[PDB]
Amino acid sequence: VQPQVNKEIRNNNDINIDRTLVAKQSVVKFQLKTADLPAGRDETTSFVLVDPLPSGYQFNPEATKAASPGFDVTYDNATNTVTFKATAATLATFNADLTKSVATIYPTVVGQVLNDGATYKNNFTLTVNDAYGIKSNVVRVTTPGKPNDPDNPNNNYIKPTKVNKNENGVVIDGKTVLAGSTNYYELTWDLDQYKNDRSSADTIQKGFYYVDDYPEEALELRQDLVKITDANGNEVTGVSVDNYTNLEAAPQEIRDVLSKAGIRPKGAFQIFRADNPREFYDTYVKTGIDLKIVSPMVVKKQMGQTGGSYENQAYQIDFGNGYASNIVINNVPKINPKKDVTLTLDPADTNNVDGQTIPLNTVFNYRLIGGIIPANHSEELFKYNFYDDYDQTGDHYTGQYKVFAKVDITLKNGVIIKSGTELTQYTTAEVDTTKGAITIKFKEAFLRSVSIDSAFQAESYIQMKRIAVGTFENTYINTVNGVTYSS
Numbered sequence: 001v002q003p004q005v006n007k008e009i010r011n012n013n014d015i016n017i018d019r020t021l022v023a024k025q026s027v028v029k030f031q032l033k034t035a036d037l038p039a040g041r042d043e044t045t046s047f048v049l050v051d052p053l054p055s056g057y058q059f060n061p062e063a064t065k066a067a068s069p070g071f072d073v074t075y076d077n078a079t080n081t082v083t084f085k086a087t088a089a090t091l092a093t094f095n096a097d098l099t100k101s102v103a104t105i106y107p108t109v110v111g112q113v114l115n116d117g118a119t120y121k122n123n124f125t126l127t128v129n130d131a132y133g134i135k136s137n138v139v140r141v142t143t144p145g146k147p148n149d150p151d152n153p154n155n156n157y158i159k160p161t162k163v164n165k166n167e168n169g170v171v172i173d174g175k176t177v178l179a180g181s182t183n184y185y186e187l188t189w190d191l192d193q194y195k196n197d198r199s200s201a202d203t204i205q206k207g208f209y210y211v212d213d214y215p216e217e218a219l220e221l222r223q224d225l226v227k228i229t230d231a232n233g234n235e236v237t238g239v240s241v242d243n244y245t246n247l248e249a250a251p252q253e254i255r256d257v258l259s260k261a262g263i264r265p266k267g268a269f270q271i272f273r274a275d276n277p278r279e280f281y282d283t284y285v286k287t288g289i290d291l292k293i294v295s296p297m298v299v300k301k302q303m304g305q306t307g308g309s310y311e312n313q314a315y316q317i318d319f320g321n322g323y324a325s326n327i328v329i330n331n332v333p334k335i336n337p338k339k340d341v342t343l344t345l346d347p348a349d350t351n352n353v354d355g356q357t358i359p360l361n362t363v364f365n366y367r368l369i370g371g372i373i374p375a376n377h378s379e380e381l382f383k384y385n386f387y388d389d390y391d392q393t394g395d396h397y398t399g400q401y402k403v404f405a406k407v408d409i410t411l412k413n414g415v416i417i418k419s420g421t422e423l424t425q426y427t428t429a430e431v432d433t434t435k436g437a438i439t440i441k442f443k444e445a446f447l448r449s450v451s452i453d454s455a456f457q458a459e460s461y462i463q464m465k466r467i468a469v470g471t472f473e474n475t476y477i478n479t480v481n482g483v484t485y486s487s
């Protein structure tokens, strides 16, 4: 039990990190120190230290040789073990005077920790004059991403999350979203597992970013509504945000970050940047305070013509490492208005006279079927109008009209308006005799009483009198919330 040995583990700035936390890809150093050799010691013929480096610890031959003057460094890549042998020069010093005790020099293993949520344990062995050895104490350090970490109570999985909500805070993931509506996306910068992190300066300078890969074909950003707040409800000011249509069209700096994180957007994307890496680090990262980003995005009007699916996903890049969030999907309903020409004013009757020549002075009806708003939608109905621009040369608006439910409508109070029910009393009409047009509008009140889980569809009949012999056409435009749909 002669020279006691002692291993120490420090980060790239020499801070003792034993039993603490450090970022993935962080440089971790091993100091294999030994106590001063006593007086009466035999000449030291051999001084060997053997370190079986831990799993997932990448050895850096170059740096350790540089950081281990006085020792010949050898490495067994096969067993990931490194060996240090005191040079001839170094030994002479251990023998300069045996009658006295002499302090020693120590080797330093330099390398990086490569895995998330892993524990890296370490000890080394000292053998002197191939006669006796001492196994050293074990030291350790963990990386973020490991729940139930007895050393870092706040540690857990690194996982950003994304969620879609409507204006009233209701979660609308997977639901149908009317064209023109807004997606109030809530992104979470998952920072809690970083609490009490002891990473070095180089590591903290690899920056902090948050990316949102948004469907640029279906949505357009409303970056003016972007809002960033932390877990404590306070506004965040150190984060700037920008967007690019595609990697190539982005600042070389951004391409490099996204590249080293293994993140490759599908086209255009929104990226958030921490302006002062250090300030951000001391304020939110090592304090474990999660950030909340709200990035509203509106569904382009053309989506309502074609219909279709659009999905959203985010990423967060901490200390240069990237992590992806869950994917949120929504689909847009294809609002398809239709008009028919009928002699009856009964929702029941399916007979029409489409394409049939109508006799002079015939009182008929234009059946204006509104677009269908599918069940399980995301926002309330605030506008549902039928607009008809008839040809005054051929048709004279009679002055009468009726409106009917085309599907079973459900109210927020549970009442089910059975399909085919007259609903005229919830509408109003403003006619422009001059130009030859008419507009039937539902009362906003009534529309907002319909449950958002309910399907909705109406149709109206506008009585017309044929004042001239001939074939005339008409434009019927159905308006649903903030978008108009023709035909």
Ligand SMILES: OC[C@H]1O[C@H](O)[C@H](O)[C@@H](O)[C@@H]1O
Binding pocket: 054, 055, 056, 057, 058, 059, 077, 080, 114
């Ligand atoms: O676990 C041991 C291994 O850890 C890492 O995977 C390193 O890439 C490799 O060099 C080393 O041998």
Ligand SMILES: OC[C@H]1O[C@H](O)[C@H](O)[C@@H](O)[C@@H]1O
Binding pocket: 123, 135, 136, 137, 138
């Ligand atoms: O790792 C070898 C030995 O190193 C130190 O002496 C520790 O105190 C002891 O508990 C351990 O068995």
Ligand SMILES: OC[C@H]1O[C@H](O)[C@H](O)[C@@H](O)[C@@H]1O
Binding pocket: 019, 150, 151
């Ligand atoms: O360093 C904190 C440590 O406190 C106690 O010693 C626990 O036994 C150990 O599991 C924990 O990691």
Ligand SMILES: OC[C@H]1O[C@H](O)[C@H](O)[C@@H](O)[C@@H]1O
Binding pocket: 024, 025, 260, 261, 262, 320, 321, 322, 323
């Ligand atoms: O290159 C090492 C690691 O760096 C970052 O963590 C990247 O996000 C990851 O994909 C990569 O494996």
Ligand SMILES: OC[C@H]1O[C@H](O)[C@H](O)[C@@H](O)[C@@H]1O
Binding pocket: 116, 157, 158, 159, 160, 322, 323, 324, 325
């Ligand atoms: O290395 C990248 C990955 O690391 C972790 O598994 C994260 O939970 C995951 O979201 C991320 O994509």
Ligand SMILES: [Ca+2]
Binding pocket: 156, 157, 158, 159, 190, 191, 192, 193
């Ligand atoms: Ca976490």
Ligand SMILES: [Ca+2]
Binding pocket: 213, 214, 215, 216, 265, 266, 267, 268, 269
């Ligand atoms: Ca995109």
Ligand SMILES: [Ca+2]
Binding pocket: 389, 390, 391, 392, 435, 436, 437
């Ligand atoms: Ca007209």
Ligand SMILES: [Mg+2]
Binding pocket: 019, 020, 021, 151, 152
């Ligand atoms: Mg600790």
